[PDB]
Design a protein around this ligand. Sequence first.
Ligand SMILES: Cc1ncc(Cn2c(C)c(CCOP(=O)(O)OP(=O)(O)O)sc2=O)c(N)n1
Ligand SMILES: Cc1ncc(Cn2c(C)c(CCOP(=O)(O)OP(=O)(O)O)sc2=O)c(N)n1
Ligand SMILES: Cc1ncc(Cn2c(C)c(CCOP(=O)(O)OP(=O)(O)O)sc2=O)c(N)n1
Ligand SMILES: [Ca+2]
Ligand SMILES: [Ca+2]
Ligand SMILES: [Ca+2]
Ligand code: NA
Lengths: 525, 525, 525
Amino acid sequence: ASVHGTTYELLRRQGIDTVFGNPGSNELPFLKDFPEDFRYILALQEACVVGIADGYAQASRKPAFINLHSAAGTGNAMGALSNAWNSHSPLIVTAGQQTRAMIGVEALLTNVDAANLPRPLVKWSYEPASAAEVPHAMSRAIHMASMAPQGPVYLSVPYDDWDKDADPQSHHLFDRHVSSSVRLNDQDLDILVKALNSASNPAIVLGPDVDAANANADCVMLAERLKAPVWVAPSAPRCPFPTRHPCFRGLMPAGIAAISQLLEGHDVVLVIGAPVFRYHQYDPGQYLKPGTRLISVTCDPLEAARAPMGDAIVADIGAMASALANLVEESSRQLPTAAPEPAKVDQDAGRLHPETVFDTLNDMAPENAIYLNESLSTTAQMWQRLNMRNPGSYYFCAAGGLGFALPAAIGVQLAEPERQVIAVIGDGSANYSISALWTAAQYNIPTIFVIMNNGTYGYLRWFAGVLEAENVPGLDVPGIDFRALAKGYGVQALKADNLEQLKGSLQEALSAKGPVLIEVSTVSP
Amino acid sequence: ASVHGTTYELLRRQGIDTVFGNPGSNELPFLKDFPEDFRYILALQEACVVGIADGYAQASRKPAFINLHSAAGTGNAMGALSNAWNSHSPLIVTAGQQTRAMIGVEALLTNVDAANLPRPLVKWSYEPASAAEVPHAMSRAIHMASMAPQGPVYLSVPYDDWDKDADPQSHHLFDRHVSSSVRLNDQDLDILVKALNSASNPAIVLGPDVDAANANADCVMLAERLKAPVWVAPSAPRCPFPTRHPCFRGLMPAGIAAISQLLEGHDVVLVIGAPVFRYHQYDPGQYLKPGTRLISVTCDPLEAARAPMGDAIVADIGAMASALANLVEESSRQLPTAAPEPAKVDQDAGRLHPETVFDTLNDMAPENAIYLNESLSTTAQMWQRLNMRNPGSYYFCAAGGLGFALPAAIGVQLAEPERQVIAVIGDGSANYSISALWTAAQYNIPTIFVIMNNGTYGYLRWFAGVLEAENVPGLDVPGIDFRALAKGYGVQALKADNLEQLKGSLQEALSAKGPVLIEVSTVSP
Amino acid sequence: ASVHGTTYELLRRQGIDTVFGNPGSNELPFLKDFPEDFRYILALQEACVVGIADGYAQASRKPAFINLHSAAGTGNAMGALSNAWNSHSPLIVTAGQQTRAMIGVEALLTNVDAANLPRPLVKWSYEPASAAEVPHAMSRAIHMASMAPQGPVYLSVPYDDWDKDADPQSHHLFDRHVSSSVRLNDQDLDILVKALNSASNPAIVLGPDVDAANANADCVMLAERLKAPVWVAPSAPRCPFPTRHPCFRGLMPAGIAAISQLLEGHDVVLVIGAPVFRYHQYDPGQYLKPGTRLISVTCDPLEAARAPMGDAIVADIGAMASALANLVEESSRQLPTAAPEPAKVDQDAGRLHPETVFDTLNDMAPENAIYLNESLSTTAQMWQRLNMRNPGSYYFCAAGGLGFALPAAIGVQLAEPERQVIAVIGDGSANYSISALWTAAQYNIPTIFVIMNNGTYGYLRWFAGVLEAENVPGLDVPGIDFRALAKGYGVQALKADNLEQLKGSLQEALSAKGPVLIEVSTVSP
Ligand SMILES: Cc1ncc(Cn2c(C)c(CCOP(=O)(O)OP(=O)(O)O)sc2=O)c(N)n1
Ligand SMILES: Cc1ncc(Cn2c(C)c(CCOP(=O)(O)OP(=O)(O)O)sc2=O)c(N)n1
Ligand SMILES: Cc1ncc(Cn2c(C)c(CCOP(=O)(O)OP(=O)(O)O)sc2=O)c(N)n1
Ligand SMILES: [Ca+2]
Ligand SMILES: [Ca+2]
Ligand SMILES: [Ca+2]
Ligand code: NA
C-alpha cells in the first residue's frame, strides 16, 4: 500500500469522510485519486475553510478534517484557529509541504519551521521525519484532536510522501479506540454530591463544553433536583440549557464584580464545562463575595489551573453531568420560577431595533432552529429573546474572532440538514469571511444569513464608552451593499428596511430551497 | 508625558505618519485622541490591512505601521505576513493585548503566548514587561523592521499601558539613526571587480531586493559595462530591470535543471538581491553546469547560508550595486541584442486569450504604470508582454500566498498617487482578499483591478499535469459575479467579454477618477 | 501584603515547604527574609539542584519547588528537565528575571524570551505581565505541575516584583483544591472488566506511573485475580511491582520485535501507567503478533495518541488500578509460578563482575532499601538480582539523561529518611552531576553511592556492536579517582577492588551515619 491509500483508510476507519479544503500544489498528491466515499467541500479562502469545518465539528460533535496549502494557507486560517482553540473544537488541520528534496533550499511554498507556525493555537503540531511515518502521525493528529479537552491540531506533510510505500505495520492504527470518558472516583464524587445535597442556596453555571458533550438534558435534571438557578458562563460560545426552562437565568455579564454580585448569597456555585471565567470588560472587584464557594468541573487542565478561585475537578463533562444528575437528592426547596417574557420595544415604520428583529425571528423560526451570533452589540437582547429549547442551538466566536459565524453557519447547516440555521451577523463582521457565501451557494447549503446593518462597528463605540475614549478613527463602515455581495457569490438576496419587509423576507427565506441573505436596516447606536 | 504621547512622538520622529488598521477593544486606548498629523486607513479584514500596508511599504521603500486586534486579528493576517517575510517588507505590526490585570485569567481577547503567535514569519516579536518600556519596545520594532534584511516585526501591547506615565529618558529614542548601508571592504571588493572584469561570458541575475533598494539604474549601468545578459531570479516578487533594455532576458523558470541549462556557457554568474534560487516545480538536475561559477550578493544571511552553490557576500544591495556599477571596466564585447517583440496570438471575437489582455494593457497603459500579478497561470506571458521601463513597476506575492495583489495594489496606489496601478488578478485569487475593494472605494484610491475570469484554478490544473495527478477535487470556481462584488464594496465595475469590450473598458477605467474593476472573460486552460 | 509574603503563603497553603536552589542576584529579593518554616537545600550546579528536587518529588509523590538563576541557571538544568518530562515529575521550576526596568535593554542576566527557553520539556512556561499577577501565576504553576499527567513547569519572575503590593483578591488562591483523580465511566469500565474476565491468557505490563500513583499493591491484586504474568515496560524509570512475586516476569527488552515475541500467545495485554512502548534499540518487526490485542491505561494523552497499536483509556492510574483490582473476577487458572533465582556467576579474587555486586547488595541491604540505577550496561542483571518488595524502590533516568541518579539519590534519601538509598552508578555517569555529592555531605543525607568503575562507557561499546560501528573515539574514561572526588566534596570514601573489600565496604557504609561513596573495580566489557 501507499502512504496515500493507507492514510485514507485510517481516516475512514476513524469515521472521517469529508475534507474541508482550499487546494494548492503541495496538496495535489494527497487529493489526487480522491476516494469515491469521501467528499470535498471547497471554500475560497482559508478562514472560510476552517470556519465551515469548525461549525461542522461543533454541531456534529466529532472531528472535522481540513486540508490547507502550506504556510500562506495555514496563516490565512490562524484567526479561525484562535476561535477553535477557545471552543475546544476537534479540528485536524493538514497542510501540504514542499517535496523533501527542496525543503532545504526553501523553494517557493516551503512551509519554513512549519510546526511552529500555528502555535500557540493548537494542541499538537508536527511534521513527520519520513513518508512511512505519515499514517502514524495522522493517527496521532486524530486522537490528539479528539481526546478531552478537544482542540485543533496541525500536521504538515511533504508532498512527495503520499506516493511512497506505507509501513505494513500501519494497519494496527486503523481501529484504535481511545477514550477520555472519565469521571471523579467514587469516594470523592460522594463527597461532592454531599456538598451539593447540603447546600442551602446552590447556583449552577454552565459553559460550552456542556453543549459539546450533549450534557444539556443531564444538566436540566441536575438543576431540577437541586432546585437551582442556572446561568450561562460569560462570552458564551454555545448554549448549554433550554432558555425558557424555569431555572434559566440567562447569560452572565463578562465582568468580575458583576459576577460576584450575581452570585452573592449563593453558598455553593457549581460551574460545569466553562472557564472560570471568560470575562471581557475590566470590572474590578471581588472574585466571589463572602459566603460563596465555587466548585468547577472542567475538561481542561488549563482552565482548572488558571481559575482565580474555587476548587476544580478535571474530567469528562458528559460523564460528570450524568453522574451528578443521577446521584444528587431531590431538594425539597421550591423550583425556581421562570424569568418573565421580555418586553416589546416600541417600533415605528422605519429602521429596525435589534429587539424587534429577535422577537420576529423567535415568532417565525422553527422550534428547532439553530442560531449563530456575530452581531456583537446585540448579544444580550438575542439571549433574552430567542427561545432555544434544544441542544446545539447557538454558536458565537469563542475567542471573539470575527469571521466565524458566516462560514460556521454553513458547516452547522451541513451537519444538521433538518434544522434551519439562521446566522445573525453585524455589517462589520459580515466582511471578514464574506467569500464563505460561495460555498453555501455551490453546495446548496440552505443557511439563512441575517445581516444587521447599522453602518458602524457598534460594540466598539460601546467599549469606547466604558474606556471613555474620544477621537477614535476607523469605527464606521458605510457603503456596503450586502445584497450585491450575496449576488456576487450566487446567494439569493433580500432587503428589509422596516418590519413589514422583515416579515416578508423571513417568510420567503424560510420557504426557500437554497441559502438566503437578508440585509436588515437596523437602528444606529 | 504618557506612553501614548511618547509613542506617537517616536513614530512621527522616525517618519511614520500612517496607521493601517482594523480596530478592536484592546486598541481603543492607543487609537483614542488620534493625532491630527496621522492618518488611519481602515480595511475590513486583517489580510487586507496587512496587504495594503505591504504594498505601501514596498512602493514607498519605507516602513509601514499596522495595528491589529489581539490574537484573532493577528491570526487573520498571518498569510499576508508569509508574503511580507519573503519580500523583506519592513512592516511594524502592533496588536492590542488585554489589560495587564486580566491577562492571567485569560479574559476574552487575551493574546496568549502573544510573541509566539506570528513566528516564524517575523524578524522580531515581543511584548513589553511594563508600560514604561513600550516606547523603547516600539523603537526596537521600528529599527528591526528597517535594518537589512528588512522584514516584518510584531509588538503586542496591553491596553492599559497607553495612559501610564512614560519614562522621561525615552526622549533619547526619538532621533536615533540606524544604518545598515554597508558594502564589501575595499580589498575584497577589488578582488570581486577583477573577477567580473576578467570573465569571458558573464551573466547577471537580479532579484527583488534590487528594486527595493532602487538599485535598478545602477544594475543597468553594471550590465552595460559588463556587456552581460540580465535575468530576473525565479518566482519574482518585483521587477528589478527595464524589460525592454537590450540586456534583458526575462524571468527565469523556477526549476533547478532549467536554470543550470540557461546559465550553461556563462563562466561567472553574478546574482544580486535574490535568494539562490526560489525554485517552485521540482526539476532535478545540476545546480550549475561545469564551467559556471556563481557569486551572490544578498542583504540576507539566511539567503547566503542556504544557497546550494556559489560564493556569497552579505551586504546592502544599494551600496553594492552602486559600487560595482562604478568600479567595473567597460568590456570591449558587443552589447547584447534586445529580445524580439512577442508575437500576436490569434484572437477571435470571443473570450480573451491572456496574451491579448497583456498586449492591450501594454498598448493603452501609461509608460509609468505599475502592475501587480496574481494571475498565476499567465505570469510568463505577462513578463514577455508588458514593457516596464521604470523601477517599482511590478509586484507578485513573494511567498506565493494568494490574497496579496488586490490589497497591495491599493497600498501601492496610495504610495504612488501619480502612477496608475493596474492589478491583474485571477478569478480564484480575487476572493482571498475581496473586501479590500472597500478601502479603495472609501478613500478613493484609483487602483484598476483586472479580473482574469476563466472559472478555474488554472495554475493548479497545470501543476496537476507536471505531477500527473488525476481525479483532484476543488479546482473549479464557477458562479462568481465580480461586477456584483465590486458594486457591493462601492467600486465601479465593467465587463469585458471580448476585445472590443476590453478596449472600451480600459479606456473608461484609465479615465476614471476612482477605483475600477473590470471582469474579463478569459479562455479556459 | 507584598507579593513575597503572599507567594510564600500560597506555597505553604499548597503543601510546599522546601526550596531546592542555586541562588543568583535575580533571586535575592525572593530568598530574602526566607520564612522560618521553609528549608532551603543548596546544590552547587543546576543539574544537581533539579536532580535532587526530582528524586525528592518522585519519592514523596508530591510537587517539589526549585529556584534557579535566570537563563544560565535554567539552561544548566535542561538535561535534568528532559528526565523530569519523561518521568512525569511534578516540578515547579522558578527562575529569577532582571528587574522590569532593565529587561528591554537586555542588561546582564536578562532571561531573553524566557518562557521559550525550557520548551519543549515543560507542561507550562510563563512570565507574568505584572508583579500583582505573580501569586496567580504561581498558583497556575503549582496546579499545572500537579495535575495528571504530572510534569515540570516553569515560571520566570522579574526581581522587582517581590516587594510590590499583592492583590488582596489573591487570598482565593490559597486553599484551591484541584483534582484529576478520575476513572473510566461505569458502562465502559464494565466492558473493560468483561474483556479481562473473558481473556484466556492475559498479560499485564506496568510502567512508572503505577509506582508514582502507589498503585503497586492494587496491581498485585489485579495480577493475582487474573492469574496473569506481569512485566515492566521497557526503559523503566521506576519499579511498579514486587520483583519476587510469583507473577513477576521482569523488565521487557526495549525492542519492537522482542516485545511482540514475548507477548505472543497472550490474547489480551493490559498496559497500565506506561508509554506504548519506550523502545531504545532498533529491532524492527511486528508491533504485536496475530492473536494479541492490547489495551493501555495511561494518565497522559500524549502517550495514548502515539501508541502504534491497541486501544487506550486516559485516566488516573491510582483510580483505575484500584477499580480494576476490585472489580475483576478471580480466574480459576493456576497462578503463575515464580521465576527461578538467578545463577551465581563465577567470581575470582580480582575485579568484580556486576552480577557479584548486585548479589552482594541483595544479600546485605535492608529489605526496604531504595536503589537507583545509572550503570547502563548492567541494568538487566540489576533487575534480575535485586529483590525489591516495596513501592518506591527503584529510579532510572527516564529520558536516558545521565547525571540523574547521583543527585536524585540524595533527594530520594531526603524524602525517605528511614529507607537506605543505594545509588549504583557507572564511572562515566558519575561525572555528569558529581558536585551533587557536596549537598549530601553538607546536609548529612546518608545516601550510599556505589561507583561501578570499569574505565569505559560500556553501554556505548555495546550499542556500537548492535550498530556494528568501528573506530569510534571518546569511549574510554580512564584516570578518575572517585575516592578523591568524594573527599573533595566531604563524603566518606571507600574502595572495593575484590569481593572481600566489597563486603567490608558495604558493611561500613551501611553502618555509617553520613553519606558514603564506594568505588568498585568492576570487570571491563
Ligand atoms: C478578527 C477581528 N478583528 C477585529 C475585531 C474587533 N471588533 C470589531 C471590529 C467589532 C465590530 C463589530 O461590528 P458589527 O457591525 O459586526 O456588529 P456591531 O455593530 O453590533 O458591533 S466587535 C470587535 O471585537 C475582532 N473582534 N475580531
Ligand atoms: C492562500 C493560498 N491558498 C491556496 C493557494 C494555492 N493556489 C491556488 C488556489 C491557485 C489558483 C489560482 O487561480 P486564479 O484563478 O487566481 O489564477 P489561474 O487561473 O491563472 O491559476 S495557484 C496556487 O498556488 C495559494 N497559493 N495561496
Ligand atoms: C547527558 C548524557 N550524555 C551522554 C549520554 C550517552 N551515554 C553514555 C555516555 C553512556 C556511558 C555510560 O557509562 P557508565 O560508565 O556510566 O556505565 P556503563 O559502563 O555501564 O555503560 S550510556 C549513554 O546513553 C547520555 N545518555 N546522557
Ligand atoms: Ca454594525
Ligand atoms: Ca482562474
Ligand atoms: Ca563504565
Ligand atoms: Na506561531
